[PDB]
């Protein structure tokens, strides 16, 4: 007998996409090869994000892509997101962008192209940037989901700003006892 624990032997991590999409799996075949046969860590990161689930691939808005592609030294670099590029109506002017994405919404496509930009697919990124050179890999906000408002210390604990689960919002819905000192206590 060997003195060892086995509860952590199996690592919980995706080796492939749960999706049965045949176009996504053709891109995984592509980047499985590039990640294996090139020393480029960029390929490994993209291969990993192709396995990732829907909530681990948040959409990247147009306004946020412009901000991150406007930092100094990022001129003529292709912005890359393994996800969806959504349009942002709060933007007034779109610059000339070169972007690679899994999906670009219909209105984001017109605005990027109308500014003189180029929209790639990941099979076109490989031919243009086999090792990922001259790229800017970008991610959407992962905690930008309604669930993360409900996580943390339970709402009924001191200095807990977690959001409760209420069927309705209003004066009659979880506001008397425990939420104001006038009714029992507050914390």
């Amino acid at each position: 007998g060997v003195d060892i624990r086995h509860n952590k032997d199996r690592k919980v991590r995706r080796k492939e996409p749960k999706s049965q999409d045949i176009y996504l799996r053709l891109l995984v075949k592509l980047y499985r090869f590039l990640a294996r046969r090139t020393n480029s860590t960029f390929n490994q990161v993209v291969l990993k994000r192709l396995f990732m689930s829907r909530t681990n691939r948040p959409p990247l808005s147009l306004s946020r892509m412009i901000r991150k592609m406007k930092l100094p030294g990022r001129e003529n670099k292709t912005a890359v997101v393994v996800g969806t590029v959504t349009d942002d109506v709060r933007v007034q002017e779109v610059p000339k962008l070169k972007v690679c994405a899994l999906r670009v919404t219909s209105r984001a496509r017109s605005r990027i192209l109308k500014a003189g930009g180029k929209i790639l697919t990941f099979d076109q990124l490989a031919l243009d940037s086999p090792k990922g050179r001259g790229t800017v890999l970008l991610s959407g906000p992962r905690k930008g989901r309604e669930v993360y408002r409900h996580f943390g210390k339970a709402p009924g604990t001191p200095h807990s700003h977690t959001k409760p689960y209420v069927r309705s919002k209003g004066r009659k819905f979880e506001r008397a006892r425990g939420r104001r000192a006038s009714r029992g206590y507050k914390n």
């Binding site: 045949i22 176009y23 799996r25 053709l26 075949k29």
Partner: protein, 124 residues
Amino acid sequence: SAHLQWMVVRNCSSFLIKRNKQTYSTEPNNLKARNSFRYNGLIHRKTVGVEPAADGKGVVVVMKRRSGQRKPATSYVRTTINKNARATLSSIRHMIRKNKYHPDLRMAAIRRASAILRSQKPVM
């Protein structure tokens, strides 16, 4: 494309047989009856098929032409070879190597031709 068409049929095809822990493919121009991307006889632009002649004499070597990829009626060119055993294999070897028409199917085509000709000998 071939790769896209293989994602549709790799596990869903009227030509797919799964049985006895084995998988085969019954479509024409598959040289090994194998459910495989290489040996599939429908999804590639260029394919090689070896079949016996209508009479039990000789083999028919089928080659897919380049042009009519969406025209099944004129897509395949058939050639009947009814020579001696060693001469038949040479023609198949030349039809593949010299044309560089799927050189990866050269020995599979040659092995299938030797199996058809052998089956056409008198049964002892």
